[PDB]
Design a protein around this ligand. Structure first.
Ligand SMILES: Nc1ncnc2c1ncn2[C@@H]1O[C@H](CSCC[C@H](N)C(=O)O)[C@@H](O)[C@H]1O
Ligand SMILES: Nc1ncnc2c1ncn2[C@@H]1O[C@H](CSCC[C@H](N)C(=O)O)[C@@H](O)[C@H]1O
Ligand SMILES: Oc1ccc(CCNCc2ccc(O)c(O)c2)cc1
Ligand SMILES: [Mg+2]
Ligand SMILES: [Mg+2]
Lengths: 242, 242
């Protein structure tokens, strides 16, 4: 993946999409997304489209959905897990109020520094505390240190696609009651629809199985209410109940 | 569409699915939606499935997406325009607190009485003020009475497609600043993605052009922020800015 492991040329799902045609997706982006996309988000996206791992980028229509959720729930304190070049991070920082705060975690800060000039020109870098690390030790460290009024309103999870289940067990204690946890890519290009699926590289197949297990688990998890949304590559919204 | 006498066999656009396969939609419904669907929503859905206009039903995955938005924004007072048998209305009523209030408007109360026994068994009928009328005169009258204490948190628009732009001009005054206005069917089975789309019923073509105009308008309307979400038949979330 982009963080470590296999090359991009080993991946086989990246050109698929969950909608029934590219024309419909293109219509959504040109009609409803790009006209509402901040100038620095446009610039960050255009640089990233030339990067080796452009396939991992959160798309522009999903970005506006993330922004809308953040504003409707009046989020102020958030955590971003899996930053890459920072498109979803810049989306979050633009949506939060002036005093919003973001904990952003990624194993590769060189990716983040690609998007940083656009984040700085947007004027919202002051909201971001970037941590270069594997996410799990940071999350475990945070659980030891966090007080009850330090809880997060919102978490966006978009990092190692086979470790979401481990992330979940921490985040249901790091996000406030009534707060939101969002898992990206829970439809995995449609490949979760079958128990067996042909021809995937091991990293892609392991992620596919991980999402099938996670999707079943989240639907049975009494600690949250859920909604799996067929936007982007599938986004599952979790709201903490207790 | 749904209206006494009208036959579904005269229409081309019936079963909603903009995903790339029936199996993918079935996966979402069976994995993430039906296990989280209230027993009275299940009962309402299953009796509606035998009705002539069962294809008008808001799908179960979209329903849980509406519920999640309502809870995340802590909505308390809402309006529902286009009720049919009451699936989205019961979804709203179950998501609101015990003392929440809904203004529900539909030209055909007989449809509502199909789902009413399930609304009653769910214990939320007391939240609902059902008005049997065309929605436009009701909204105009609402502009004459209510003030900011009576502004709505949330509006779901799912009635006669050619009147959405007219509904919008009232709802941007009836919903509070920061409140949400949602429009169902804004991708109209994918047919909005092209300038021309052969093979439609005349009323379906009027709706298709209405949505192409609406989608362009909403993307340009400075009074709201938007997110068009590729769920169900397309849902456009609008958030009132001022
Ligand atoms: N174990 C781990 N801990 C933290 N980040 C990880 C990780 N494994 C992979 N990652 C990072 O997760 C990212 C996934 S791509 C994330 C996309 C980004 N949210 C966007 O808006 O476009 C990569 O940058 C990768 O470096
Ligand atoms: N002018 C109008 N004013 C109010 N309702 C109207 C209308 N024209 C049509 N309708 C109603 O709009 C509905 C569309 S179907 C709505 C489905 C419903 N929201 C669900 O959850 O399944 C029909 O019940 C129809 O009677
Ligand atoms: O002017 C029209 C023309 C055709 C239709 C039928 C569309 N297919 C069923 C349907 C009906 C109403 C809905 O709200 C919905 O999502 C799905 C409706 C209104
Ligand atoms: Mg992703
Ligand atoms: Mg509809």
């Amino acid at each position: 993946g982009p963080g470590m492991g296999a090359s991009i040329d080993d991946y086989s799902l990246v050109h698929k999409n969950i909608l029934h045609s590219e024309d419909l997706l293109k219509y959504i982006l040109e009609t409803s997304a790009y006209p509402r996309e901040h100038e620095q988000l446009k610039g960050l996206r255009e640089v990233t489209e030339k990067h080796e791992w452009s396939s991992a980028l959160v798309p522009a229509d999903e970005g506006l959905f993330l922004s809308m959720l953040l504003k409707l729930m009046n989020a102020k304190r958030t955590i971003e897990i899996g930053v890459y070049t920072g498109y979803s991070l810049l989306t979050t920082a633009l949506a939060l109020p002036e005093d919003g705060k973001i904990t952003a975690i990624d194993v590769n800060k060189s990716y983040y520094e690609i998007g940083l000039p656009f984040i700085q020109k947007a004027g919202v870098e002051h909201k971001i505390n970037f941590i270069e690390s594997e996410a799990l030790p940071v999350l475990d460290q945070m659980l030891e240190e966090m007080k009850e009024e330090d809880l997060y309103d919102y978490a966006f999870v978009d990092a190692d696609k086979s470790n979401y289940a481990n992330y979940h067990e921490r985040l249901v204690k790091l996000v406030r009651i009534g707060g939101a946890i969002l898992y990206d890519n829970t439809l995995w290009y449609g490949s979760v629809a079958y128990p067996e699926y042909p021809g995937l590289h091991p990293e892609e197949e392991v992620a596919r199985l991980s999402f099938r297990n996670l999707n079943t688990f989240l639907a049975a998890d009494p600690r949250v209410e859920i909604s799996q949304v067929s936007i982007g590559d599938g986004v599952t919204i979790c709201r903490r109940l207790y």
